[PDB]
Amino acid sequence: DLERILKTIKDKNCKKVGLQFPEGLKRQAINIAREIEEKTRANVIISGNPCFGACDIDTILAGSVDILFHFGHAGMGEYENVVFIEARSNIDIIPAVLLKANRIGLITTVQHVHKLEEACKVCVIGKGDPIYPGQVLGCNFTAARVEEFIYIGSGIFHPLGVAIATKKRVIAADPVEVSPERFLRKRGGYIAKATGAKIFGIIVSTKSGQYRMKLAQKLKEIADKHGKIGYIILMDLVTPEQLLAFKADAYVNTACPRITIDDAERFHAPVLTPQEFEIVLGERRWENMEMDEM
Amino acid sequence: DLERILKTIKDKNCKKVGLQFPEGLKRQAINIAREIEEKTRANVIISGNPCFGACDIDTILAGSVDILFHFGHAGMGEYENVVFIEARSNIDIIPAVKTALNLLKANRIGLITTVQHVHKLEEACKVIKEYGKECVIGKGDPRAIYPGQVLGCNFTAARVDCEEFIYIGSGIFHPLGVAIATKKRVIAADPFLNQAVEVSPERFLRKRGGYIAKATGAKIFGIIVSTKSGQYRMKLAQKLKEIADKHGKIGYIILMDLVTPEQLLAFKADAYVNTACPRITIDDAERFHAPVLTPQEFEIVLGERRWENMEMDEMI
Ligand SMILES: C[S@@+](CC[C@H](N)C(=O)[O-])C[C@H]1O[C@@H](n2cnc3c(N)ncnc32)[C@H](O)[C@@H]1O
Ligand SMILES: C[S@@+](CC[C@H](N)C(=O)[O-])C[C@H]1O[C@@H](n2cnc3c(N)ncnc32)[C@H](O)[C@@H]1O
Ligand code: SF4
Ligand code: SF4
């Protein structure tokens, strides 16, 4: 893709250029900056912060350069001077493509979204929202709002999320039939532990696509409506170290919902999704359990 | 303390209040928020990021609240709605001063300290003069507000006419910097242990000499800039990138908030130049996986500064 970047800089005669990478790709940062500074007149600034997705735009860097190039993710939101360099996986998914139903849904991650159209020939792909048909995220299952499901990729969080959010069967094909019962007992365990919690830290992230302050204020009032207390804690990164310093009984995460699931055993008090918080408080019934979405 | 905060909230009729603590005081955050929300009508938001000092204001939070209370440090900069609740310690420092008087060899003495003892420096100065000596307290600047106050990144209070210094406080980084910055003898007097020692910059400079040597064969540098409110040095970084190119090397500017070993390891640079908090360079040296240099040590490595022309990295 490096030639589109060079052409975009020259054609826009960019003078200052920002680069932002997911963790998996910062190993390439210095080489890409080298190519740009050698083959253009632009000066490069690399973002040095962790970056977890298109929900995590370095907007400070973006407001300092003519164009910020953000790698590894499909776009999100609308910032005038951020270009998303997608970076797709070249692997073949047709080997991976147990079913029972006649209408079968395709869902995947951004790295394979270009390959759905022909996996479909081998069926209705689900259109998303503000990106691609069939794309799901840890925080967004719109593409699954379309009888059974085949997910394409690695990891089990995405198929689980689809299975919980639509209550349909999902086959997970890496390039496995997904059981959400193991995940729901787990989340049940955290709800039980937090049932006797009296004081809650309500986590809000300033990251560009993870900020949910209005929901946090709602959650604070719902806690007080039920004779408990939540204090809003505003931060950038959400980490077990930073939550240990505040002496709360339990936490409610309104930032990235995969923090809540992935890094669960790593936190030293219970960390809850908004919806599990409501169940702990008595505002929502356990049967009305849903995936945290943004 | 808490009475000042409550009064300020009621005098200024605040509805949204922010709290920011250094790491040692986040343990009190919830208790202080509770007190505020029970005794006022205000809603509290607590900053959850690391906070390293008054150089590290949570300006996103401050731009979201009527007033941000920032704890533990003396003020710095000029932020319209930030109130600094400083960390003042009540330990008697005069016994440490007396111990340090044993060690002096000159009659004209400078006094410096950290923020938690600046209110007692005038009393120390009186005792030192009562014991036959001349004594002076240097004025700070817009960064080190109080007379006699030094920071890891600011030794202006030490730029005074005196023969030797007494530093009052714990740790040895501050008197080391004063010793290196002034070329004068420094006695470090710790009021909590009541001991005085003569600081020696030799082990310090031998250590810094070791990192310059490792970075001397470096071809590619990451030049680190922090977006923190009082640590941002982009113009300097742009200068150092040009200076590297002038000398047949390459520096790439890397803009970040926290500067940590994990973040520096993700980039394939041979070495780094840190224009953020100078104490990162010193304290965390052994933890980084490539050499990290001060701006001035960078100039040595490149050929812009004699290797003995060694100065402390200061924020100014
Ligand atoms: C690795 S990304 C997942 C990839 C992709 N974003 C997706 O939609 O599935 C999710 C991980 O990023 C990290 N993460 C996301 N937002 C974070 C935040 N605000 N603070 C700290 N870690 C965060 C968490 O460790 C979480 O497990
Ligand atoms: C302990 S505080 C210093 C307290 C006081 N401000 C002073 O003048 O001495 C300095 C430490 O904070 C950490 N620190 C400061 N700024 C930082 C930054 N931008 N990123 C990561 N760590 C930082 C470094 O580890 C450094 O050792
Ligand atoms: S799952 Fe988390 S990291 Fe991925 S897009 Fe959603 S908020 Fe960002
Ligand atoms: S030494 Fe570092 S942490 Fe202390 S005031 Fe200076 S920049 Fe901030």
XYZ file of C-alpha atoms and ligand atoms in Angstrom:
680
model
C 0.000 0.000 0.000
C 3.096 2.139 0.434
C 2.753 3.564 -3.090
C -0.726 4.967 -2.383
C 0.752 6.639 0.696
C 3.587 8.236 -1.278
C 1.203 9.361 -4.017
C -1.253 10.782 -1.476
C 1.529 12.820 0.152
C 2.980 14.200 -3.096
C -0.469 14.865 -4.609
C -1.513 16.693 -1.464
C 2.067 18.041 -1.167
C 1.933 17.124 2.513
C 4.609 18.776 4.642
C 4.016 17.015 7.982
C 2.858 13.383 8.122
C 1.700 11.325 11.117
C 1.878 7.518 11.315
C -0.178 5.389 13.721
C 0.075 1.580 14.041
C -1.542 -1.266 15.994
C 0.916 -3.014 18.298
C 1.436 -5.776 15.730
C 2.828 -3.295 13.220
C 4.984 -0.759 15.112
C 7.935 -3.003 14.143
C 7.464 -1.442 10.683
C 7.128 2.191 11.776
C 10.751 3.264 11.401
C 11.066 1.669 7.978
C 7.895 3.332 6.696
C 8.982 6.721 8.034
C 12.320 6.149 6.259
C 10.629 5.513 2.885
C 8.438 8.593 3.292
C 11.226 10.949 4.296
C 13.556 9.586 1.600
C 11.028 9.614 -1.245
C 9.061 12.756 -0.292
C 9.742 16.090 1.356
C 7.345 15.332 4.209
C 8.564 15.175 7.792
C 7.138 12.218 9.715
C 5.936 11.953 13.300
C 5.150 8.451 14.608
C 2.607 8.037 17.366
C 4.307 6.210 20.225
C 1.191 5.336 22.264
C -0.543 1.959 22.329
C -3.233 1.752 19.659
C -5.990 -0.833 19.790
C -8.102 0.016 16.741
C -9.823 2.679 14.697
C -11.614 3.464 17.986
C -8.205 4.704 19.192
C -7.199 7.515 16.828
C -4.253 9.640 17.922
C -6.261 12.871 17.571
C -3.506 14.963 19.176
C -1.099 13.785 16.469
C -3.832 14.277 13.858
C -4.295 17.921 14.851
C -0.548 18.511 14.389
C 0.063 17.070 10.895
C -1.408 17.586 7.442
C -2.299 13.909 7.176
C -2.290 11.094 9.755
C -1.932 7.577 8.314
C -3.589 5.019 10.593
C -2.756 1.391 9.843
C -4.290 -2.037 10.318
C -7.917 -0.996 10.798
C -10.880 0.002 8.700
C -12.075 3.527 9.344
C -14.409 4.717 12.077
C -16.011 8.091 12.726
C -14.967 11.061 10.603
C -11.718 13.010 11.060
C -10.851 15.138 8.064
C -7.140 14.341 7.798
C -6.915 10.658 8.855
C -6.371 8.053 6.125
C -7.034 4.421 7.011
C -4.575 1.979 5.468
C -6.568 -1.222 5.840
C -3.892 -3.945 5.575
C -5.659 -7.187 4.611
C -4.651 -10.815 5.102
C -3.640 -12.664 1.936
C -4.597 -16.083 3.332
C -7.116 -18.368 1.634
C -10.333 -18.827 3.636
C -12.062 -21.324 1.313
C -10.366 -24.292 3.076
C -11.984 -23.182 6.331
C -15.401 -22.501 4.775
C -21.309 -28.788 10.406
C -24.208 -26.605 9.310
C -27.905 -27.355 9.849
C -29.871 -24.352 8.537
C -30.595 -23.293 4.962
C -29.883 -19.564 5.360
C -26.270 -19.188 6.529
C -24.677 -15.894 7.570
C -21.085 -14.867 6.869
C -19.170 -12.710 9.355
C -15.421 -12.090 9.724
C -12.858 -9.438 10.728
C -11.463 -6.609 8.632
C -8.435 -8.634 7.474
C -10.674 -11.071 5.551
C -13.694 -8.940 4.617
C -12.658 -8.807 0.940
C -12.898 -12.602 0.741
C -16.512 -12.974 1.915
C -18.086 -12.401 -1.505
C -16.575 -15.609 -2.898
C -16.928 -17.617 0.310
C -20.630 -16.829 -0.101
C -20.689 -18.599 -3.495
C -19.333 -21.730 -1.787
C -26.275 -17.177 2.237
C -26.584 -13.483 3.174
C -23.704 -11.270 4.320
C -24.794 -8.685 6.875
C -24.405 -4.984 6.214
C -22.917 -2.979 9.065
C -22.948 0.668 10.130
C -20.437 3.487 10.699
C -17.933 -0.461 7.985
C -17.922 -3.470 5.633
C -20.584 -6.124 5.117
C -19.867 -9.169 7.262
C -17.384 -7.289 9.452
C -17.839 -7.701 13.202
C -15.825 -6.142 16.031
C -15.450 -6.993 19.701
C -17.860 -4.094 20.327
C -20.195 -4.329 17.338
C -22.324 -7.206 16.029
C -24.600 -5.323 13.620
C -23.309 -7.482 10.764
C -24.842 -10.457 12.613
C -28.276 -8.775 12.730
C -29.292 -10.633 9.583
C -30.504 -18.581 10.650
C -27.048 -19.956 11.468
C -23.577 -18.375 11.283
C -20.072 -19.115 10.040
C -17.362 -16.835 11.446
C -14.032 -16.548 9.625
C -10.913 -15.803 11.615
C -9.000 -16.628 14.759
C -9.995 -16.156 18.381
C -13.310 -17.143 19.952
C -14.551 -13.794 21.313
C -16.185 -12.760 18.040
C -18.165 -16.016 17.492
C -19.187 -15.989 21.163
C -20.406 -12.405 20.847
C -22.455 -13.261 17.779
C -23.873 -16.368 19.474
C -24.931 -14.363 22.537
C -26.202 -11.308 20.614
C -28.454 -13.292 18.223
C -28.966 -16.624 20.085
C -28.084 -18.562 16.910
C -25.558 -21.312 16.290
C -22.089 -20.229 15.143
C -19.282 -22.284 13.581
C -15.833 -20.718 14.041
C -13.420 -21.501 11.181
C -9.763 -20.456 11.546
C -7.654 -20.004 8.398
C -15.348 -25.330 15.958
C -18.935 -24.840 17.137
C -18.976 -21.979 19.651
C -20.399 -22.642 23.130
C -21.448 -19.486 25.024
C -22.388 -21.463 28.160
C -18.767 -21.479 29.340
C -18.628 -17.700 28.820
C -21.937 -16.986 30.608
C -21.057 -18.998 33.706
C -17.837 -16.967 33.785
C -19.661 -13.657 33.537
C -22.135 -15.044 36.058
C -19.257 -15.561 38.472
C -18.192 -11.918 38.326
C -21.762 -10.706 38.834
C -22.042 -12.860 41.954
C -18.735 -11.554 43.366
C -19.800 -7.914 42.812
C -23.261 -8.453 44.378
C -21.927 -7.410 47.801
C -19.910 -4.505 46.382
C -20.865 -1.136 47.858
C -18.565 1.338 46.017
C -18.041 1.298 42.243
C -15.492 3.028 40.052
C -17.147 3.770 36.727
C -14.430 3.726 34.057
C -14.549 6.189 31.136
C -11.855 6.313 28.444
C -10.930 9.489 26.553
C -9.944 7.390 23.506
C -11.584 8.767 20.365
C -14.069 5.940 19.830
C -14.337 4.623 23.417
C -15.634 7.708 25.241
C -19.065 6.988 26.822
C -19.359 9.672 29.535
C -23.146 10.033 29.133
C -23.642 6.318 29.838
C -21.305 6.581 32.844
C -23.403 9.374 34.331
C -26.509 7.286 33.728
C -24.851 4.325 35.471
C -23.898 6.583 38.403
C -27.524 7.661 38.872
C -28.805 4.091 38.547
C -26.378 2.995 41.272
C -27.602 5.773 43.569
C -31.217 4.906 42.737
C -30.414 1.478 44.231
C -28.585 2.604 47.336
C -25.032 2.171 46.018
C -22.306 4.580 44.874
C -20.369 4.961 41.646
C -17.522 7.454 41.104
C -16.593 8.291 37.528
C -12.903 7.628 36.785
C -11.743 9.265 33.516
C -8.596 7.830 31.912
C -6.844 7.018 28.647
C -5.507 3.486 29.038
C -7.544 1.097 31.194
C -5.199 -1.284 33.066
C -5.229 -3.432 36.222
C -2.446 -1.306 37.706
C -4.383 1.920 37.323
C -7.522 0.404 38.860
C -5.626 -1.059 41.850
C -4.664 2.408 43.125
C -8.324 3.436 43.609
C -9.844 1.558 46.488
C -13.168 0.531 44.977
C -15.067 -2.697 45.603
C -15.692 -3.252 41.889
C -15.576 -1.454 38.587
C -17.887 -0.820 35.669
C -16.093 -0.509 32.317
C -17.649 1.855 29.759
C -14.463 1.888 27.611
C -13.543 -0.974 25.229
C -15.832 -3.930 26.146
C -13.155 -6.516 25.343
C -11.112 -5.114 28.234
C -13.949 -6.416 30.410
C -13.760 -9.956 28.991
C -10.164 -10.446 27.833
C -8.246 -8.943 30.772
C -10.767 -10.197 33.356
C -8.667 -12.493 35.564
C -5.901 -9.840 35.472
C -7.918 -7.200 37.378
C -7.886 -7.525 41.155
C -11.539 -6.526 41.727
C -14.589 -7.377 39.569
C -14.870 -5.425 36.312
C -18.378 -5.387 34.836
C -20.026 -4.415 31.595
C -22.777 -1.781 31.811
C -25.394 -4.495 31.452
C -23.916 -6.742 34.184
C -23.765 -3.679 36.450
C -27.500 -3.201 35.915
C -28.097 -6.837 36.852
C -25.994 -6.462 40.019
C -27.991 -3.352 40.963
C -31.384 -4.943 40.332
C -32.200 -2.731 37.333
C -32.008 -5.582 34.767
C -32.807 -9.292 34.990
C -30.047 -11.829 34.375
C -32.063 -13.368 31.532
C -31.945 -9.963 29.784
C -28.173 -10.354 29.357
C -26.610 -8.754 26.260
C -23.162 -8.106 24.825
C -21.746 -4.656 25.496
C -21.768 -2.821 22.143
C -20.708 0.614 20.981
C -6.876 20.800 53.080
C -10.322 19.343 52.486
C -11.784 22.501 54.059
C -10.109 24.617 51.366
C -11.569 22.428 48.616
C -15.104 22.541 50.064
C -14.918 26.316 50.536
C -13.585 26.805 47.005
C -16.385 24.664 45.566
C -19.038 26.634 47.455
C -17.445 30.056 46.816
C -17.172 29.253 43.091
C -20.498 27.332 43.023
C -18.929 24.376 41.195
C -21.209 21.681 39.808
C -18.551 19.469 38.188
C -15.262 18.900 40.041
C -12.137 17.068 38.844
C -9.513 15.395 41.056
C -5.964 14.499 40.038
C -3.420 12.741 42.295
C 0.190 11.557 41.990
C 0.570 7.807 42.420
C 1.100 7.836 46.172
C -2.150 9.718 46.758
C -4.591 7.942 44.418
C -5.227 5.797 47.507
C -7.187 8.762 48.914
C -9.121 9.578 45.719
C -12.396 7.826 46.539
C -12.455 9.158 50.099
C -12.011 12.727 48.865
C -14.640 12.317 46.132
C -17.094 10.943 48.725
C -16.507 13.876 51.069
C -17.060 16.318 48.202
C -20.224 14.662 46.917
C -21.806 14.376 50.386
C -20.967 17.897 51.566
C -21.501 19.785 48.285
C -23.833 19.497 45.325
C -20.885 18.861 42.984
C -20.318 15.755 40.873
C -16.742 14.416 41.028
C -14.660 13.008 38.174
C -11.322 11.439 39.197
C -8.428 11.358 36.736
C -7.332 7.751 36.395
C -4.088 8.242 34.419
C -0.625 8.187 35.969
C 0.273 11.666 37.160
C 3.922 12.465 37.708
C 3.787 16.110 38.778
C 2.568 19.575 37.960
C 4.172 18.986 34.525
C 1.463 16.367 33.971
C -1.885 18.161 34.243
C -4.958 16.254 33.081
C -6.065 18.996 30.702
C -8.738 16.836 29.089
C -10.310 16.473 32.525
C -9.727 20.147 33.320
C -11.539 21.090 30.110
C -14.547 19.033 31.263
C -15.081 20.418 34.802
C -15.645 23.734 36.528
C -12.461 23.253 38.565
C -9.735 20.611 38.692
C -7.974 20.068 42.013
C -4.459 18.790 41.394
C -2.700 17.334 44.450
C 0.820 16.864 45.762
C 2.749 19.385 43.647
C 3.326 23.117 43.581
C 1.684 24.932 40.706
C 3.264 25.225 37.275
C 2.186 26.825 34.033
C -0.959 28.946 33.879
C -4.205 26.960 33.682
C -7.341 28.942 34.354
C -9.325 26.373 36.360
C -6.628 24.288 38.091
C -6.164 24.602 41.850
C -2.970 23.118 43.279
C -3.241 21.529 46.737
C 0.403 21.114 47.553
C 1.941 18.342 49.657
C 3.458 20.123 52.664
C 5.325 17.938 55.183
C 5.557 18.952 58.850
C 8.857 17.244 59.752
C 11.293 19.429 61.667
C 14.173 19.983 59.224
C 16.407 21.934 61.634
C 18.054 18.771 63.088
C 19.149 17.726 59.580
C 20.432 21.289 58.988
C 22.503 21.043 62.169
C 23.997 17.737 61.036
C 24.839 19.279 57.669
C 26.624 22.172 59.371
C 29.232 19.639 60.539
C 30.074 18.891 56.916
C 30.447 22.406 55.510
C 33.868 23.794 54.666
C 32.881 27.261 53.424
C 31.075 30.237 54.911
C 28.677 31.212 52.074
C 25.895 28.610 51.875
C 23.011 28.041 49.474
C 19.824 26.287 50.607
C 17.564 24.274 48.276
C 14.824 21.677 48.815
C 11.667 20.153 47.360
C 8.133 21.504 47.613
C 7.285 19.697 50.853
C 9.944 21.677 52.773
C 9.951 25.093 51.028
C 7.938 26.627 53.861
C 10.731 25.842 56.349
C 13.710 27.132 54.325
C 13.447 30.594 55.884
C 13.820 29.018 59.333
C 16.796 26.915 58.222
C 18.430 29.996 56.707
C 18.093 31.778 60.044
C 19.719 28.898 61.936
C 22.653 28.704 59.494
C 23.322 32.420 59.871
C 22.972 32.142 63.663
C 25.878 29.655 63.450
C 28.302 32.131 61.827
C 27.598 31.428 58.158
C 26.239 33.497 55.335
C 23.196 31.858 53.780
C 21.056 32.542 50.710
C 17.941 31.060 49.107
C 17.794 31.287 45.335
C 14.610 32.371 43.622
C 12.996 29.930 41.236
C 11.176 30.842 38.022
C 7.782 30.168 36.329
C 8.509 26.431 36.663
C 9.974 26.211 40.201
C 7.777 28.801 41.885
C 9.198 28.811 45.449
C 12.537 30.207 46.602
C 14.995 27.361 47.120
C 12.881 24.774 45.289
C 14.541 22.336 42.890
C 12.881 19.824 40.559
C 14.348 16.886 38.670
C 14.177 19.149 35.625
C 14.979 22.561 37.133
C 18.003 23.786 39.131
C 17.410 27.552 38.855
C 17.168 27.865 42.657
C 20.814 26.721 42.780
C 22.044 29.453 40.427
C 23.054 31.718 43.323
C 26.224 33.269 44.729
C 27.392 30.741 47.309
C 30.313 28.396 47.894
C 28.454 25.210 48.886
C 24.887 23.945 49.185
C 22.749 22.137 51.684
C 19.884 20.222 50.060
C 17.081 19.288 52.455
C 15.129 16.180 51.507
C 15.390 12.495 50.704
C 16.832 10.801 47.659
C 20.107 11.743 45.984
C 19.049 12.728 42.448
C 18.318 16.368 43.319
C 21.625 17.183 45.104
C 23.490 15.288 42.368
C 21.957 17.535 39.720
C 22.777 20.642 41.764
C 26.349 19.388 42.154
C 26.641 18.738 38.401
C 24.783 21.921 37.393
C 26.801 24.292 39.611
C 30.189 22.555 39.983
C 29.859 23.218 43.737
C 29.943 21.010 46.813
C 26.513 19.835 48.017
C 25.581 18.386 51.398
C 22.347 16.371 51.337
C 20.495 16.444 54.676
C 17.525 14.108 55.081
C 15.124 15.431 57.768
C 13.356 12.066 58.217
C 16.512 10.062 58.988
C 18.425 13.127 60.288
C 21.657 12.374 58.455
C 23.880 14.508 56.227
C 26.114 13.200 53.438
C 28.342 14.785 50.827
C 27.023 13.854 47.400
C 29.502 12.664 44.761
C 28.585 12.907 41.046
C 31.285 10.372 40.059
C 29.226 7.162 40.089
C 26.458 9.149 38.370
C 28.639 10.417 35.518
C 30.372 7.053 35.113
C 26.928 5.528 34.649
C 25.909 8.168 32.123
C 29.284 7.634 30.437
C 28.342 3.983 29.951
C 25.162 4.796 28.005
C 26.857 7.356 25.776
C 29.430 4.698 24.919
C 26.704 2.189 24.010
C 24.880 4.747 21.843
C 28.043 5.858 20.004
C 27.694 3.156 17.347
C 23.975 3.927 16.893
C 22.815 4.804 13.406
C 19.066 5.290 13.899
C 17.496 7.219 16.789
C 13.965 7.643 18.058
C 13.480 11.194 19.355
C 10.821 10.978 22.068
C 8.359 13.825 22.628
C 5.694 13.698 25.371
C 2.335 15.363 24.966
C 2.149 15.886 28.743
C 1.282 19.460 29.596
C 4.667 20.443 30.993
C 6.948 17.959 29.169
C 6.326 18.785 25.495
C 9.567 19.784 23.685
C 8.803 19.422 19.968
C 10.905 22.424 18.858
C 13.882 20.893 20.647
C 13.111 17.531 19.061
C 12.939 19.069 15.593
C 16.301 20.700 16.295
C 17.906 17.424 17.405
C 16.650 15.670 14.243
C 18.365 18.301 12.084
C 21.514 18.043 14.215
C 21.581 14.273 13.697
C 21.225 14.663 9.929
C 23.987 17.287 9.876
C 26.202 14.554 11.407
C 25.276 11.695 9.080
C 22.753 9.999 11.373
C 18.962 9.719 11.394
C 16.426 10.632 14.066
C 12.703 9.946 13.819
C 10.369 11.930 16.040
C 8.048 9.738 18.132
C 5.159 11.545 19.867
C 3.601 9.818 22.881
C 2.075 10.445 26.306
C 3.670 7.968 28.726
C 7.292 7.082 27.958
C 7.887 3.437 28.920
C 10.294 0.616 28.026
C 7.489 -1.422 26.495
C 6.576 1.383 24.126
C 10.176 2.042 23.142
C 10.833 -1.665 22.453
C 8.089 -1.796 19.795
C 10.230 0.480 17.549
C 13.414 -0.825 15.928
C 15.570 2.200 16.797
C 19.195 1.642 17.766
C 18.900 4.275 20.534
C 16.644 7.029 21.827
C 16.820 10.692 22.787
C 14.306 11.673 25.477
C 12.938 15.237 25.342
C 10.202 14.345 27.900
C 10.788 14.213 31.693
C 14.598 14.160 32.254
C 14.266 11.785 35.164
C 12.947 9.119 32.814
C 16.419 9.073 31.261
C 18.157 8.633 34.620
C 15.791 6.607 36.795
C 14.482 4.116 34.248
C 17.817 3.769 32.357
C 18.460 0.147 33.372
C 14.883 -0.854 32.435
C 14.984 0.312 28.789
C 16.148 -2.213 26.217
C 18.164 0.271 24.105
C 20.143 3.316 25.278
C 18.110 6.426 26.173
C 19.957 9.751 26.177
C 19.414 13.303 27.340
C 19.456 16.010 24.639
C 22.928 17.048 25.752
C 24.280 13.484 25.783
C 22.897 13.208 22.248
C 24.966 16.240 21.260
C 28.034 14.485 22.679
C 27.304 11.294 20.735
C 26.840 13.297 17.520
C 29.836 15.610 17.904
C 28.337 18.907 19.107
C 29.584 18.913 22.706
C 32.849 17.850 24.344
C 32.318 14.642 26.332
C 33.255 16.464 29.552
C 30.939 19.368 28.646
C 28.277 17.546 30.677
C 25.166 19.417 31.858
C 21.841 18.416 33.400
C 18.799 18.275 31.119
C 16.516 21.057 32.356
C 13.016 22.036 31.280
C 13.069 25.703 30.303
C -6.533 -6.365 20.906
S -7.947 -5.265 20.656
C -9.007 -6.385 19.700
C -8.907 -6.214 18.189
C -10.000 -5.373 17.530
N -10.016 -4.021 18.069
C -11.385 -5.995 17.702
O -12.381 -5.328 17.436
O -11.568 -7.148 18.097
C -8.796 -5.515 22.239
C -7.769 -5.434 23.349
O -7.229 -4.123 23.310
C -6.987 -3.656 24.618
N -7.640 -2.344 24.793
C -8.633 -1.813 24.012
N -8.945 -0.594 24.509
C -8.179 -0.353 25.597
C -8.110 0.713 26.477
N -8.906 1.782 26.330
N -7.204 0.658 27.507
C -6.371 -0.424 27.659
N -6.461 -1.472 26.789
C -7.354 -1.441 25.781
C -7.541 -4.682 25.589
O -6.452 -5.413 26.088
C -8.348 -5.641 24.745
O -8.141 -6.961 25.187
C 9.021 10.203 40.576
S 8.451 11.539 39.481
C 9.374 12.994 40.039
C 8.721 13.844 41.114
C 8.964 15.344 40.967
N 8.196 15.849 39.833
C 10.450 15.695 40.816
O 10.754 16.764 40.303
O 11.393 14.989 41.203
C 9.591 11.226 38.113
C 9.363 9.813 37.616
O 8.095 9.805 36.993
C 8.129 9.045 35.814
N 7.669 9.893 34.691
C 7.704 11.261 34.611
N 7.218 11.606 33.391
C 6.905 10.498 32.689
C 6.387 10.286 31.412
N 6.108 11.299 30.583
N 6.171 8.991 30.997
C 6.475 7.922 31.816
N 6.985 8.143 33.065
C 7.194 9.414 33.496
C 9.577 8.620 35.589
O 9.676 7.254 35.876
C 10.406 9.346 36.619
O 11.269 8.448 37.273
S -13.458 -4.124 20.599
Fe -12.405 -2.575 21.778
S -10.513 -2.284 20.600
Fe -11.938 -3.323 19.123
S -12.972 -1.643 18.038
Fe -14.298 -2.112 19.814
S -13.487 -0.641 21.390
Fe -11.886 -0.696 19.804
S 11.469 15.912 36.866
Fe 10.037 15.009 35.422
S 8.232 14.581 36.676
Fe 9.453 16.144 37.928
S 8.591 18.121 37.326
Fe 10.360 17.711 35.954
S 9.319 16.707 34.159
Fe 7.807 16.560 35.834
